[PDB]
Design a protein around this ligand. Structure first.
Ligand SMILES: *[C@@H]1O[C@H](CO)[C@@H](O[C@@H]2O[C@H](CO)[C@@H](O)[C@H](O)[C@H]2NC(C)=O)[C@H](O)[C@H]1NC(C)=O
Ligand SMILES: *[C@@H]1O[C@H](CO)[C@@H](O)[C@H](O)[C@H]1NC(C)=O
Ligand SMILES: *[C@@H]1O[C@H](CO)[C@@H](O)[C@H](O)[C@H]1NC(C)=O
Lengths: 53, 569
């Protein structure tokens, strides 16, 4: 249960994702919580890809 | 219910004009006694207002302002007590009812039953079509101590008035019709009488009567000056406890009553607290502590050890004056289970204020409320960080009591938000007050919430407009999960159901537990999947374990130290 609420905050706080992306991830998370690890990495990879340069 | 709470928005324009009329209807439908103020403002010309016809008493003041309608059906209104006054002056304020440059505007007041105003004055201004107000003898309606109440009365009109029916005692009426003659009650009495029904001495009302009567008994009053003890008007309610002289102890009075508004009462109504001092209140006094009875009843009682620290919300204690939740006060809620007061999130909450240098509140900071379970007041959200798709920070919030209401009307309000769902998945009660959810463009899952189940009295309702269209939400798969009983949920996926259809694994609603198959094997209990002990040996087609412990396995994966399974001997 704590697994979920962490992932939520994790995604919400990533500096380089815009809100739309953050929603997509959070939504998919709420749809299937077991994917939190997969979605979490997915979101971090894109966050780093969009890092300001 | 004969009793209802009024409002408190005065001349402010309605938050939701599309729902305003409907709101009023839910508020005053069949209501007879208005705890607080009866505010009737911005009513459009053809508006049906018959829901007001039962009202006899208004505790507060009456405000009839900025209306287009031609009449307000208040013929039964008998007494306004003036517990609060509009602008601390007026018990009755009739302002600005007339077209803003066939014609609209109030035409007659028609308050033919209005014979007692305990406290406060009268203000009647800028009503182009209004007649007969200059005609009324106000000092008769005013209570004896009220003679001097101030009375500011504009007369400019845009039409000539017909004369008061020849039938009227003076030439004094509340309108054209002959039913509309002001009945005089205080000024026309034999001897120094308070109130009377006629010129004769035996027509004088009882000392406890308020507007008038139909007989000399305290059972014959048109209103109670002090308290309504089951038809009888009285100075006090029969006290809760009697001292016995033949035993020198105080055994409770079986006749004991509680003072509710202006009526004596057996027990307090639903959302109210019962005090030692014998009253029903929405707040405990100093040194007094809120205690839930084993049933559900709430009570105030004296603290044995000086009362323990407690979280105060906006509108309370040192936050009495404070308008919103900000970076300056967010900490005061750190790990509170219960907030005595309310919470508001306004734009200024989220874009800070350099003038005070208060920093903009940061999304992560909202995590202090993750433990919150109860709010005694209200919850008002007109701004929410766009990076959060729902209100899950309030995931564990169970009750909003509504003992204090935003604008004296609303216990829960969400407007202009941009959240996609709610996520208030523990919310099971709105103690009192109306709910309002509107102008949230992306908001789904409003229809899927059983508002019905959350309310507690029949003057409550959910007003809503301008959210995300419902069939747009379904197109996007934003509806309740397969597994949510009766199709109620707070949002998307299987962690959002109100009641789960099959079984729960923690918070997640799931079809089958893992009894016969699945990585970590489970036993079942009260519809909850729970894990077999790590030392248990998984089974093919048969059951794996019968409970949490090591003695409950069907086989061990390591070593048996009877009756347990270990990794030891
Ligand atoms: C005081 O309370 C009594 C009883 O609680 C009120 O009497 C009720 O009045 C309503 C409408 O006015 C009737 O429909 C009920 O049938 C009455 N109930 C009973 C038990 O008689 C009474 O009107 C209240 N106010 C005053 C001034 O007496
Ligand atoms: C009802 O209100 C409308 C709109 O203001 C007005 O045009 C119309 O005359 C009214 N109808 C009746 C039947 O009174
Ligand atoms: C059950 O069968 C599986 C796979 O066919 C096997 O790996 C396992 O050893 C068996 N377990 C028991 C308790 O017989």
């Amino acid at each position: 249960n704590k697994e979920m609420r962490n992932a939520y905050w994790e995604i919400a706080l990533l500096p380089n994702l815009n809100n739309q992306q953050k929603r997509a991830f959070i939504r998919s998370l709420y749809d299937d919580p077991s994917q939190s690890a997969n979605l979490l990495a997915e979101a971090k990879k894109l966050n780093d890809a969009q890092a300001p340069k | 219910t004969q009793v209802c709470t009024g409002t408190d928005m005065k001349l402010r324009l309605p938050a939701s004009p599309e729902t305003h009329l409907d709101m009023l209807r839910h508020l005053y439908q069949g209501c007879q006694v208005v705890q607080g103020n009866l505010e009737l403002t911005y009513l459009p010309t053809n508006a049906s207002l018959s829901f007001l016809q039962d009202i006899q008493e208004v505790q507060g003041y009456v405000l009839i302002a900025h209306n287009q309608v031609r009449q307000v059906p208040l013929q039964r209104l008998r007494i306004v007590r003036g517990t609060q006054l509009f602008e601390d002056n007026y018990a009755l304020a009739v302002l600005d009812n007339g077209d803003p440059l066939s014609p609209g505007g109030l035409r007659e007041l028609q308050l033919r039953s209005l014979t007692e105003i305990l406290k406060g004055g009268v203000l009647i201004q800028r009503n182009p079509q209004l007649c007969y107000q200059d005609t009324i003898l106000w000092k008769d309606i005013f209570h004896k101590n009220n003679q001097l109440a101030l009375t500011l009365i504009d007369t400019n009109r845009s039409r000539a008035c017909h004369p008061c029916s020849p039938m009227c005692k003076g030439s004094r009426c509340w309108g054209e019709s002959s039913e509309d003659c002001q009945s005089l009650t205080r000024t026309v009495c034999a001897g120094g009488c308070a109130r009377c029904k006629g010129p004769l001495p035996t027509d004088c009302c009882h000392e406890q009567c308020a507007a008038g009567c139909t007989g000399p008994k305290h059972s014959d009053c048109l209103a109670c000056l002090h308290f309504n003890h089951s038809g009888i008007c009285e100075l006090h309610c029969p006290a809760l406890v009697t001292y016995n002289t033949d035993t020198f102890e105080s055994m409770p009075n079986p006749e004991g009553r509680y003072t509710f508004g202006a009526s004596c009462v057996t027990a307090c109504p639903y959302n109210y607290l019962s005090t030692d001092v014998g009253s029903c209140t929405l707040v405990c006094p100093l040194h007094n502590q809120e205690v839930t009875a084993e049933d559900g009843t709430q009570r105030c009682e004296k603290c044995s050890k000086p009362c323990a620290r407690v979280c105060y919300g906006l509108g309370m204690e040192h936050l009495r004056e404070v308008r919103a939740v900000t970076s300056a006060n967010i900490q005061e809620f750190a790990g509170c289970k219960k907030i005595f007061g309310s919470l508001a999130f306004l734009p200024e909450s989220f874009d800070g204020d350099p003038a005070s240098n208060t920093a903009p509140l940061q999304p992560e900071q909202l995590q202090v409320f993750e433990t919150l379970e109860e709010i005694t007041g209200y919850l008002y959200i007109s701004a929410w960080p766009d990076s959060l798709p729902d209100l899950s920070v309030f995931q564990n919030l169970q009750v909003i009591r509504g003992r204090i209401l935003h604008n004296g009307a609303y216990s829960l309000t969400l407007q202009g938000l941009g959240i996609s769902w709610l996520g208030l998945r523990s919310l099971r009660e709105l103690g009192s007050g109306l709910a309002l959810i509107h102008h949230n463009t992306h908001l789904c899952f409003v229809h899927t919430v059983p508002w019905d189940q959350l309310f507690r009295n029949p003057h409550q309702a959910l007003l809503h407009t301008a959210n995300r269209p419902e069939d747009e939400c379904v197109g996007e798969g934003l509806a309740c999960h397969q597994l949510c009983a009766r199709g109620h949920c707070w949002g998307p996926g299987p962690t959002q159901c109100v009641n789960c259809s099959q079984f729960l694994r923690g918070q997640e609603c799931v079809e089958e537990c893992r009894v016969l198959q699945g990585l970590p094997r489970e036993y079942v209990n009260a519809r909850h999947c729970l894990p077999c002990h790590p030392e248990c040996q998984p089974q093919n087609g048969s059951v794996t374990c019968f409970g949490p412990e090591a003695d409950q396995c069907v086989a061990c994966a390591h070593y048996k130290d009877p009756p347990f399974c270990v990794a030891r001997c």
